[PDB]
Amino acid sequence: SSQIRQNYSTEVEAAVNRLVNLYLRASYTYLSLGFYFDRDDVALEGVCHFFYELAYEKYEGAYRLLKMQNQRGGRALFQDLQKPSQDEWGTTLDAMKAAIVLEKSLNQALLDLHALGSAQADPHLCDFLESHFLDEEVKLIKKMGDHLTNIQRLVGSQAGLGEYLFERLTLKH
Amino acid sequence: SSQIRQNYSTEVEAAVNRLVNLYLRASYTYLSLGFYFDRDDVALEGVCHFFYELAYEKYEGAYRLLKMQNQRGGRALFQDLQKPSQDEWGTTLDAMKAAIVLEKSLNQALLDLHALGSAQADPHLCDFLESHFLDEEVKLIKKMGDHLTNIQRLVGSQAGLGEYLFERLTLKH
Amino acid sequence: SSQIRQNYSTEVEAAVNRLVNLYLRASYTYLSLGFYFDRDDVALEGVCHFFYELAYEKYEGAYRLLKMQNQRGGRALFQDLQKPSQDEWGTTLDAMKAAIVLEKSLNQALLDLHALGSAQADPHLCDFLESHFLDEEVKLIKKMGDHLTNIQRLVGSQAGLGEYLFERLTLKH
Amino acid sequence: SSQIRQNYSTEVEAAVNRLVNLYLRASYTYLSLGFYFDRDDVALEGVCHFFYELAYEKYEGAYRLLKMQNQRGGRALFQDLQKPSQDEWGTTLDAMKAAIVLEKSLNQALLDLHALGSAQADPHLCDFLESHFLDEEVKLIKKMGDHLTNIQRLVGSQAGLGEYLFERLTLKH
Amino acid sequence: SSQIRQNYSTEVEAAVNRLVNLYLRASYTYLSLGFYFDRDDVALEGVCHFFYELAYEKYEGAYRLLKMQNQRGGRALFQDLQKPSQDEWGTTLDAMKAAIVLEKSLNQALLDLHALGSAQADPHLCDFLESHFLDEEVKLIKKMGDHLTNIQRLVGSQAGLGEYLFERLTLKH
Amino acid sequence: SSQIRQNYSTEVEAAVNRLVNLYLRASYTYLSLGFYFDRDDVALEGVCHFFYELAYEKYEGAYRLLKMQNQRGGRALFQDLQKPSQDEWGTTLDAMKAAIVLEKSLNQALLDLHALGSAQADPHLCDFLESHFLDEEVKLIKKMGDHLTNIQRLVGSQAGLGEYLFERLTLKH
Ligand SMILES: [Cl-]
Ligand SMILES: [Cl-]
Ligand SMILES: [Cl-]
Ligand SMILES: [Cl-]
Ligand SMILES: [Cl-]
Ligand SMILES: [Cl-]
């Protein structure tokens, strides 16, 4: 069949197509989070920018997986993309809790694919994930944990004040 | 309900959410077209770049609709995104024929929304489509028609030669 | 014996010396391919430049292995270098088919050495190959597969025309 | 407990805290080596600079481990730091022999932690060590071995002359 | 014994070695304070930077003492370094109270060494401390007192809000 | 047969292919000499650089011969390349004695080919060797003779000292 494929299992090829769907789902989730915080009755610009940047980051992860699929001689296959889990995302705290749950689900999927690649003795796959995904994910989850702690300390007796101050003084606008 | 909404019908709000889904579907279609032409057994770089640029253009149309939805005080609602119509896209000619069918479907959806806005006496909506969508679509469909004519004249007795030459001498690589 | 050697097996040391011989053999093969396409009765400058650049790339892989051998405290040992498999390399298509066979043989040798290093719990060796060899090889084999597809589509009824056009419009001159 | 911790064993967390202590011990050893060669009755500036730079390099390795500990959601724990093994370090040859023994002890600790991470299927840990520690250590031990050979060839009949010349013509002052 | 030593008592030499240990202990304390505020469940970047800068300042004080010891012809002697007094440092207020207690202990040690040097008629020692340590310490303790007053005024009814605001609007991030 | 060949004997064509093998053998010899002096138990950087530069110079002589072979319409033919005469090269003096023996063997081969070209009344060949090879060889052999005299004068009673000093003060590092 393939003129270039070498040491690239059907199991890894399939798992890469599934991981693309997970990253595009995550990208779509962040697009929805961004436009919720852009609503005139929510109006938290720095929160909107935080999640819009993540929509782009997750799309770029999908793009790198698809590029690698073709570099290895697998076939990119696209499936339907489910809509995000919510239409309205609550407070900045609710949204950042949803985001860290989403990132730990992507991180577990990365770790599971790395374990498959290790079992299949596919060092190019293992290095690819180590070099472009695992540390990106650890650093993002650490950032979200930092943000969750600062959001939680600002709730106090005065949730609205804390939510304003976090968006103004931690996030970019 | 909304503090800003003025002269913005529920019919237009719903039709804008549907049009976002159509543009994101089109974006996803172009992502698939791009990665098909990137395959080592297809390998037409200028065709890959043509369709990848359209994936971005259609995403940007979805983004402008969502921005406008919030500017008017409607609620952005995301639905599932169906996968593209094909997994393999045939020749450059097959792909460019699929692309012009897709663009005429987006153009008809734009014209239908403009007619709804005109019936609802919503001049901001009508101007928005006139200023950011209708001419973009006319110019792209003219470009695709130009390309289809040049692809068709190169088929001759020697399809492979013509497909190479079109990618090398008309498309960007 | 060695003042610096640590966690560096005799098996890996020997396999690194063998891999140097394989890369220098490959370099010599590409020098022959380059000078064949430089003949006045072949005269395909872009094909000559493609293979001459690969002679340098394979020499550089041999040089990095030898540097690493000394960094680990092994002893570089040189053996005779067999001449290339052919004196005349046929068409650009014949030559590019020979080149992808040669690159998949180097890639398998890399994967076999990585497996030895993994079995010997030699993470410096494994990372060295992951960081400087495995992706270089995947990217080159993808490029050759792209080129083989474009060469094959240009054969048509008119092999000479296709061979000229590929050298003029894809390769660098 | 931890909001960010994922795939991070208590065994690795503890071993990282121990490795921090080993690197800070090594840093302190190099601070002592540097100030010994700064004595007016020793007075080998290039030897002082060599070991002072290593005090900084080992401190930076401790700092990167502590940063990573927090990125993974482990708890940095500091323990007492033992003083260096000697108060006086003898000749440049004695000092460079002590330094290579110290670096091979750090390298073995790195390899042992990498093996623990591999057993615990912790690819982020394994990649972290591969990317920031293993090659740094191989390159430093090779440099020290080079220096030991040049110091040994200069002993001759005239140790003082050789020790001066090595400091003047190989080390930086 | 020493070719350069002049007017440099054994009492001062010993007291300088003890003061080095006190400054390295203080440096290690500030390294621990810095990494505590870097935890994802503490996450006060400006507090982390404040204490990390002090780890460097205290290390530099140790380095200047060791340099001076050799300039005078004394022998630098290193002893074990005890770990910091706490593993967890509480609130920014708790940490800044611990820091001013630590700085007043270093200041008293400086004053005691100055008194020893004065009793031993060692004007080089006395001037050294006056020129590089006493004013540095007065200025730092004044800064910490300023910070303690601003932290205390922000506790109010809403400790978390005050702790965020102090880190955002007084400390550097 | 050849459309361009004119005044180019089969004897010269064959002798040029043999001379290519001699120059590639010499290049390989210098690669081995370079990596021997890079060993941590040899560690003479300026000696390593001297011989590595000669590996490149001899490769370039082979390349110019092959270019000229095609310019004249002869056929480049590659044969097996024997490994270098030694695996270990002894002292700098031993290595430089081996190198001058190797260069006088290349110089005699150049002179023999020039005599063949003169007998065959092939002035292009004779001028080619005069313009790109004979003086290069005379100048290199003079340089090596200069180096041998300086190495010999430094042996004295203290071989290691002399070998260090020559590498430090004559060769490039
Ligand atoms: Cl769903
Ligand atoms: Cl569908
Ligand atoms: Cl053979
Ligand atoms: Cl101890
Ligand atoms: Cl203690
Ligand atoms: Cl032989």
Alpha carbon distance D129, D136 (integer Å): 10
Integer angstrom CA distances of residue B12 from A34, B2, B68, B116, F26: 22, 16, 12, 7, 81
Decide if F62 contacts F24 (C-beta within 8 A).
yes
F25: tokens are 């053998």
Rounded Cα gap, residues A96 and A91, in angstroms: 9
Q: Tokens in use for A122?
A: 């596919």
Last residue before each gap in chain E (C to N over 2.5 A): none
Instruction: Establish how many alpha carbons lie within 13 A of residue F127's alpha carbon, considering only the half-sphere containing its beta carbon.
Output: 4
Under a CB-based contact definition with an 8 Å cutoff, are residues F84 and F99 in contact? no
Q: Strand, coil or helix: what is D140?
A: helix
The answer to whether D13 and D69 have CB atoms below 8 angstroms apart is yes
CB of A77 within 8 A of CB of A17?
Answer: yes
Under an 8 A CB cutoff, do A157 and E160 touch?
no
8 Å CB contact of C83 and F83? no
Backbone dihedral angles phi then psi of residue D81, each to the nearest 5 degrees: -110, 115
Query: Which of A6, A121, A127 is opposite residue C130, by nearest beta carbon?
Result: A127
Name the residue with tokens 């061979």: C163
- Residues 6 or more apart in contact with residue D110 via CB below 8 angstroms: D19, D129, D133, D134, D137
Chain A, window 120-159: residues with a beta carbon less than 8 angstroms from a chain D beta carbon? 126, 129-131, 134-135, 138-139, 141-142, 144-145, 148-149
Other beta carbons within 10 angstroms of residue F23's beta carbon come to: 23
Question: Taking the mean position of all CA atoms in its chain, how far away is CA D66?
Answer: 16
Q: C16: closest CA among C156, C168, C164, C126?
A: C126
CA distance C113 to C73: 18
Q: Nearest to residue E32, comparing CAs of A145, D17, D14?
A: D17
| Residue that is written with structure tokens 């290519």 in the block | F20
From the centroid of its chain, how far is CA B169?
Answer: 24
Residue E80 DSSP label: -
| C62 in Cβ contact with C18 (< 8 Å) | no
What is the distance of C-alpha D133 from the center of its chain?
Answer: 10
Give the residue carrying structure tokens 């300023």: E146
Number of H helices, E strands in chain D: 6, 0
Token readout for E64 is 């200047």
B137-145 own/partner pairs: CB under 8 Å, 24+ apart: B137/B103, B137/B106, B137/B107, B137/B110, B138/B107, B140/B54, B140/B57, B140/B103, B141/B100, B141/B103, B141/B104, B141/B107, B144/B96, B144/B99, B144/B100, B144/B103, B145/B100
Instruction: Compute the distance between CA of residue A166 and CA of residue D56 in angstroms, rounded to an integer.
Output: 37
This structure's resolution (Å) is 1.5
Output b/e per residue, C57-92; b: 16+ Cβ within 10 A.
ebbebbbebbebbbbbbbbbbbeebebbeeeebebb
Q: What kind of experiment solved this structure?
A: X-ray
Neighbours of F99 (CB within 10 A): 23
CB B71 within 8 A of CB B131: no
Question: Residue with structure tokens 């098996």?
Answer: C11
Residue B48 makes CB contacts below 8 A (sequence gap 6+) with B34, B35, B37, B38
Nearest to F42 among D149, D165, D170 (CB): D149
Question: Is residue C80 a contact partner of residue F87, using CB atoms and an 8 Å limit?
Answer: no
Q: Is the dihedral of CA E106, E109, E115, E117 positive or negative?
A: negative
CA distance C137 to chain A (A): 10
CA distance E9 to E121: 10
Determine the distance separating the centroid of ligand 1 and the alpha carbon of A82, expressed in angstroms: 4
Length of chain C: 173
Query: What's the burial of A152, exposed, middle or buried (CB within 10 Å: 0-12/13-18/19+)?
Result: middle
Q: How many angstroms is it from D21 CA to the middle of ligand 5?
A: 14
| Beta carbons of F46 and F171 less than 8 angstroms apart | yes
CA trace torsion C133, C135, C139, C140 (10° rounding): 10
- Nearest to residue B16, comparing CAs of B61, B65, B59? B65
Tokens standing for residue A114: 């790395």
- Could you give the CA distance from residue D91 to residue D69 in angstroms, rounded to a whole number? 38
Q: Residues for chain E: how many in total?
A: 173
User: In this complex, is the C-beta atom of A53 within 8 Å of any C-beta atom belonging to chain B?
Assistant: no
Q: Let me know: does D89 contact D28? Beta carbons within 8 Å.
A: no
Q: List, in order, residues 6 or more apart from C131 with CB less than 8 Å away.
A: A127
Sole residue written with tokens 């009344």: F121
| Measured distance CA(A159)–CA(A157) in Å, rounded | 6
Ligand 2 centroid, distance to B79 Cα (angstroms): 13
Give the DSSP letter of residue C77: -
The DSSP H or E segment spanning E24 is helix E10-37
Residue B166 backbone zone (phi > 0: left; psi -120 to 50: alpha; other: beta): alpha
How far is the C-alpha of C81 from the C-alpha of F32, rounded, in Å? 13
* B122 contacts: CB under 8 Å, gap ≥ 6: B7, B8, B9, B12
Question: CA B71, CA B64: separation in Å to the nearest integer?
Answer: 10
CA of C155 to the centre of ligand 2 (A): 38
**DSSP element (H, E) containing C160:** helix C159-169
Sign, CA torsion D109/D114/D117/D123: positive
* A153: chain E residues, CB-CB within 8 Å: 160-161, 163-164
Q: Measure CA of the first residue to CA of the last residue in chain D; give whole Å.
A: 52
D151 and D96 Cβ atoms separated by less than 8 Å: yes
Place of tokens 């007796």: A157
Q: How many CA atoms lie within 13 A of E154 on its CB side?
A: 21
d(CA B48, CA B30): 9
* DSSP labels, D21-68: HHHHHHHHHHHHHHHHHTSTTT--HHHHHHHHHHHHHHHHHHHHHHHH
User: How many C-beta neighbours within 10 Å does residue B138 have?
Assistant: 12
Q: Are D34 and D51 in contact (CB under 8 A)?
A: yes
Residue B81 pairs with which residues in a beta bridge?
A81
CA A43 to chain centre: 23
* Beta-bridge mates of residue F81: C81
Contact present, A145 and A111 (Cβ < 8 Å): no
The residue type at B152: Q
SS3 F81: strand
Helix (H) or strand (E) holding E118: helix E92-119
Work out the angle between the directed axes of helices D92-119 and D10-37 (0-180°, nearest 10): 170
Sequential DSSP letters for chain B: --SS--S--HHHHHHHHHHHHHHHHHHHHHHHHHHHHTSTTT--HHHHHHHHHHHHHHHHHHHHHHHHHHHHT-------BPPPS-S---SHHHHHHHHHHHHHHHHHHHHHHHHHHHHTT-HHHHHHHIIIIIHHHHHHHHHHHHHHHHHHHHHTT-HHHHHHHHHHHTS--
Note whether B17 and B73 are within 8 A (CB): no
- Cβ distance of D145 and F41 shorter than 8 Å: yes
Pairwise CA distance, residues F173 & F164, whole Å: 12
Is the alpha carbon torsion for A24, A28, A33, A38 positive or negative? positive
Burial of D45 from C-beta contacts in 10 A (0-12 / 13-18 / 19+): middle
Three-class secondary structure of residue D81 per DSSP: strand
Q: Do the beta carbons of residue C19 and residue C113 sit within 8 Å?
A: yes
β-sheet bridge partners, residue A81: B81
Q: Give the C-alpha separation, A43 to A160, whole Å.
A: 12
Chain A residues whose beta carbon lies within 8 Å of the beta carbon of residue E165: 165, 169
What CA–CA distances, in Å, run from F33 to A14, A78, B147? 50, 56, 60
DSSP codes of every residue in D146-162: HHHHHHHHHHTT-HHHH
Task: Compute the 3-state secondary structure of chain C and give helix, strand, coil in percent, each to the nearest 5.
Answer: 75, 0, 25
Residues in chain D: 173
Torsion angles phi and psi, residue F36, rounded to 5: -65, -45
Amino acid at F168: R
Q: Is E81 helix (H, G, I), strand (E, B) or coil?
A: strand
- The pairs formed by E110-116 with CB atoms below 8 angstroms and a separation of 24 or more are E110/E19, E110/E134, E110/E137, E112/E15, E113/E12, E113/E15, E113/E16, E113/E19, E116/E9, E116/E11, E116/E12, E116/E15
Of the candidates B3, A17, D23, D67, which has an alpha carbon nearest to the alpha carbon of residue E38?
Answer: D67
Q: What is the separation of C-alpha B92 from the centre of its chain, rounded to a whole number of angstroms?
A: 17
Query: Which residue, F109, F112, F114, F110, is CA-closest to F125?
Result: F114
| Selected residues 72-91 of chain C with any CB under 8 Å from a CB in chain A | none
> CA separation (Å) from B79 to A35, B61, B76, C2?
14, 17, 10, 66
CA C47 to centroid of chain Cα atoms: 16
Residue of C170, A146, B96, A156 lying closest to E161 (CA atoms): A156
CA angle (F50, F55, F61) in 5-degree steps: 125
- d(Cα C32, Cα D35) in Å, to the nearest integer? 59
**Distances, alpha carbon A93 to alpha carbons A11, A99, A163, E39, F131, in Å:** 38, 10, 8, 19, 79
3-state helix, strand, coil in chain F (%, to 5): 75, 0, 25
Closest CA to D104 of D166, D26, D47: D26
Do chains A and B touch by CB distance (3+ pairs < 8 Å)?
yes
Count of CA atoms in the C-beta half-sphere (13 A) of B159: 5
Ligand in nearest proximity to the CA of C78: 6
Distance CA B86, CA B97 (A): 13
Rounded CA-CA distance B112/B123 in Å is 15
Partners of C81 in the β-ladder: F81
Distance (Å, whole) CA F129 – CA F111: 9
Which residue's entry shows tokens 């398998």? C108
List residues bridging with E23 in a β-sheet: none
Place of tokens 């004979």: F134
Q: Could you tell me the two tokens for C150?
A: 């474009």
Q: Residue B43: CA atoms inside 13 Å, Cβ hemisphere, count?
A: 22
Do C124 and C140 meet the contact criterion of CB atoms below 8 Å apart? Answer: no
- For chain F, the chains sharing at least 3 beta-carbon pairs closer than 8 angstroms are C, D
One-letter amino acid of A78: F
Nearest CA distance, D171 vs chain F (angstrom): 12
Phi, psi of C38 (to 5 degrees): -80, -15
| Alpha carbon distance E68, E16 (integer Å) | 9
The answer to whether residues E40 and A149 touch, using CB atoms and an 8 Å cutoff, is yes
Residue C100: how many CB atoms within 10 A of its CB? 18
Backbone angles phi, psi at F81, to 5 degrees: -110, 115
Amino acid at A11: E
Q: DSSP strand E in chain F: where?
A: none
